[PDB]
Motif scaffolding. Structure first.
Motif, PDB file in Angstrom:
ATOM      1  N   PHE A   1       0.946  -1.099   0.055  1.00 22.59           N
ATOM      2  CA  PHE A   1       0.021   0.001  -0.010  1.00 22.59           C
ATOM      3  C   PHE A   1       0.901   1.309   0.151  1.00 22.59           C
ATOM      4  CE2 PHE A   1      -4.134  -1.872   1.972  1.00 22.59           C
ATOM      5  CZ  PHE A   1      -4.506  -2.410   0.728  1.00 22.59           C
ATOM      6  N   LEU A   2       2.066   1.233   0.728  1.00 28.06           N
ATOM      7  CA  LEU A   2       2.722   2.481   0.938  1.00 28.06           C
ATOM      8  C   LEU A   2       3.459   2.534  -0.401  1.00 28.06           C
ATOM      9  CD1 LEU A   2       4.663   1.936   4.305  1.00 28.06           C
ATOM     10  CD2 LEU A   2       2.444   3.438   3.701  1.00 28.06           C
ATOM     11  N   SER A   3       3.790   1.473  -1.320  1.00 22.42           N
ATOM     12  CA  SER A   3       4.371   1.638  -2.637  1.00 22.42           C
ATOM     13  C   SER A   3       3.573   2.444  -3.413  1.00 22.42           C
ATOM     14  CB  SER A   3       5.003   0.437  -3.008  1.00 22.42           C
ATOM     15  OG  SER A   3       6.110   0.081  -2.447  1.00 22.42           O
ATOM     16  N   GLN A   4       2.152   2.043  -3.404  1.00 18.92           N
ATOM     17  CA  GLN A   4       1.213   2.508  -4.272  1.00 18.92           C
ATOM     18  C   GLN A   4       0.926   4.239  -3.778  1.00 18.92           C
ATOM     19  OE1 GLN A   4      -2.131   0.260  -3.412  1.00 18.92           O
ATOM     20  NE2 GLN A   4      -1.024  -1.627  -4.064  1.00 18.92           N
ATOM     21  N   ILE A   5       1.212   4.556  -2.507  1.00 20.13           N
ATOM     22  CA  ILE A   5       1.151   5.932  -2.018  1.00 20.13           C
ATOM     23  C   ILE A   5       2.535   6.690  -2.487  1.00 20.13           C
ATOM     24  CG2 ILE A   5       0.968   7.461  -0.105  1.00 20.13           C
ATOM     25  CD1 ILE A   5      -0.647   5.271   1.301  1.00 20.13           C
ATOM     26  N   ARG A   6       3.469   5.919  -2.625  1.00 21.16           N
ATOM     27  CA  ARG A   6       4.853   6.683  -2.776  1.00 21.16           C
ATOM     28  C   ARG A   6       4.771   6.702  -4.314  1.00 21.16           C
ATOM     29  NH1 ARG A   6       9.601   5.208  -5.131  1.00 21.16           N
ATOM     30  NH2 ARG A   6      11.431   6.078  -4.326  1.00 21.16           N
ATOM     31  N   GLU A   7       4.329   6.168  -5.191  1.00 20.78           N
ATOM     32  CA  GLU A   7       4.262   6.444  -6.516  1.00 20.78           C
ATOM     33  C   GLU A   7       3.185   7.675  -6.804  1.00 20.78           C
ATOM     34  OE1 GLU A   7       5.281   5.447  -9.939  1.00 20.78           O
ATOM     35  OE2 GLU A   7       7.093   5.639  -8.822  1.00 20.78           O
ATOM     36  N   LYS A   8       2.221   7.685  -6.175  1.00 15.63           N
ATOM     37  CA  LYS A   8       0.968   8.979  -6.238  1.00 15.63           C
ATOM     38  C   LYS A   8       1.739  10.045  -5.668  1.00 15.63           C
ATOM     39  CE  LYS A   8      -2.745   7.232  -7.875  1.00 15.63           C
ATOM     40  NZ  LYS A   8      -4.073   7.301  -7.030  1.00 15.63           N
ATOM     41  N   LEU A   9       2.720  10.075  -4.862  1.00 16.73           N
ATOM     42  CA  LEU A   9       3.372  11.425  -4.456  1.00 16.73           C
ATOM     43  C   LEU A   9       4.411  11.751  -5.432  1.00 16.73           C
ATOM     44  CD1 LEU A   9       4.188  10.556  -0.664  1.00 16.73           C
ATOM     45  CD2 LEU A   9       2.425  11.776  -1.604  1.00 16.73           C
ATOM     46  N   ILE A  10       5.145  10.879  -6.000  1.00 21.63           N
ATOM     47  CA  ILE A  10       6.063  11.096  -6.966  1.00 21.63           C
ATOM     48  C   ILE A  10       5.440  11.841  -8.207  1.00 21.63           C
ATOM     49  CG2 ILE A  10       7.569  10.022  -8.748  1.00 21.63           C
ATOM     50  CD1 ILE A  10       8.047   8.034  -6.615  1.00 21.63           C
ATOM     51  N   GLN A  11       4.089  11.119  -8.536  1.00 22.32           N
ATOM     52  CA  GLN A  11       3.365  11.612  -9.766  1.00 22.32           C
ATOM     53  C   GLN A  11       2.614  12.789  -9.616  1.00 22.32           C
ATOM     54  N   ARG A  12       2.295  13.152  -8.595  1.00 23.13           N
ATOM     55  CA  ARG A  12       1.308  14.363  -8.174  1.00 23.13           C
ATOM     56  C   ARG A  12       2.347  15.462  -7.683  1.00 23.13           C
ATOM     57  NH1 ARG A  12      -3.644  12.104  -8.651  1.00 23.13           N
ATOM     58  NH2 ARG A  12      -4.081  10.099  -7.904  1.00 23.13           N
ATOM     59  N   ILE A  13       3.236  15.201  -7.146  1.00 22.73           N
ATOM     60  CA  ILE A  13       3.940  16.300  -6.573  1.00 22.73           C
ATOM     61  C   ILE A  13       5.330  16.549  -7.246  1.00 22.73           C
ATOM     62  CG2 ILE A  13       5.070  17.230  -4.203  1.00 22.73           C
ATOM     63  CD1 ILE A  13       3.059  15.635  -2.582  1.00 22.73           C
ATOM     64  N   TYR A  14       6.096  15.738  -7.376  1.00 23.70           N
ATOM     65  CA  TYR A  14       7.393  15.763  -8.095  1.00 23.70           C
ATOM     66  C   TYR A  14       7.375  15.511  -9.674  1.00 23.70           C
ATOM     67  CZ  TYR A  14       8.666  15.251  -3.187  1.00 23.70           C
ATOM     68  OH  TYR A  14       8.910  15.294  -1.930  1.00 23.70           O
ATOM     69  N   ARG A  15       6.327  15.407 -10.240  1.00 26.71           N
ATOM     70  CA  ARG A  15       5.861  15.443 -11.472  1.00 26.71           C
ATOM     71  C   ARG A  15       6.646  14.329 -12.313  1.00 26.71           C
ATOM     72  NH1 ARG A  15       3.915  20.136  -9.947  1.00 26.71           N
ATOM     73  NH2 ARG A  15       4.089  22.185 -11.381  1.00 26.71           N
ATOM     74  N   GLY A  16       6.806  13.168 -11.570  1.00 28.40           N
ATOM     75  CA  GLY A  16       7.730  12.107 -12.103  1.00 28.40           C
ATOM     76  C   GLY A  16       8.937  11.980 -11.892  1.00 28.40           C
TER      77      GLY A  16
END
Ligand SMILES: [Mg+2]
Length: 209
Positions: A109-124
């Protein structure tokens, strides 16, 4: 009864070119120009609060809790988030109640959350920070509420930067040092008296687990 919490330590980028190289200008504008001010009830010193990392940290915590709520199916789950200026990095201690996320599936679940942050905040962009998204282990560690007054509340400026909670007993404490001081003493008083009761206890099965 009050539940247990997982702790997720999130390092927060505090240097654009070194931590988020090539990040978009809109991110740059956002972080460079966003102003912060302490609430009326706060007794903290704003001059000690780094606003640009605070700006990122607020969105990280914001987006983490959104994704945690979705993934845990716990819409009003309990959390205490504290933003710190560490020895080497700005970081957040994210305490969120274990409800809805069994320890066995936490990591996935945390990995899923982690990728979301990368996508949503750090633009990839994978932020150039070592071990920047880690859950506290022993397996997955579960701390009870006492972790907050024991380890988070006693922090002062400039180590203490900011804090968020939906936990009603820690609302005023988030940005007020005097209230934090009160709660630590109050908790420690209860702990001390609990210790004393244990020693003085003459009842059966006083067997320390
Ligand atoms: Mg720390």
């Amino acid at each position: 009864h009050m539940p247990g919490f997982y702790e997720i330590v999130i390092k927060v980028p505090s240097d654009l070119d070194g931590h988020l190289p090539g990040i978009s200008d809109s991110f740059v504008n956002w972080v460079a120009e966003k102003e912060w001010e302490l609430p009326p009830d706060s007794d903290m010193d704003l001059n000690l609060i780094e606003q640009a990392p605070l700006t990122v940290a607020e969105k990280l915590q914001r987006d983490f809790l959104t994704e945690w709520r979705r993934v845990s199916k716990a819409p009003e789950a309990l959390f205490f988030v504290q933003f710190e200026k560490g020895e080497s990095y700005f970081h957040m201690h994210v305490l969120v109640e274990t409800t809805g996320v069994k320890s066995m599936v936490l990591g996935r679940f945390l990995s899923q959350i982690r990728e979301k942050l990368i996508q949503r905040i750090y633009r990839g962009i994978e932020p150039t920070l070592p071990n920047w998204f880690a859950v506290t282990k022993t397996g997955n560690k579960v701390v009870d509420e006492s972790y907050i007054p024991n380890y988070l509340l006693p922090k002062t400026q400039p180590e203490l930067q900011w804090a968020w909670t939906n936990m009603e007993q820690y609302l005023s404490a988030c940005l007020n040092l005097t209230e934090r001081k009160r709660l630590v003493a109050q908790h420690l008083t209860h702990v001390s008296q609990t210790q004393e009761q244990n020693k003085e206890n003459q009842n059966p099965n006083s067997d320390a687990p």
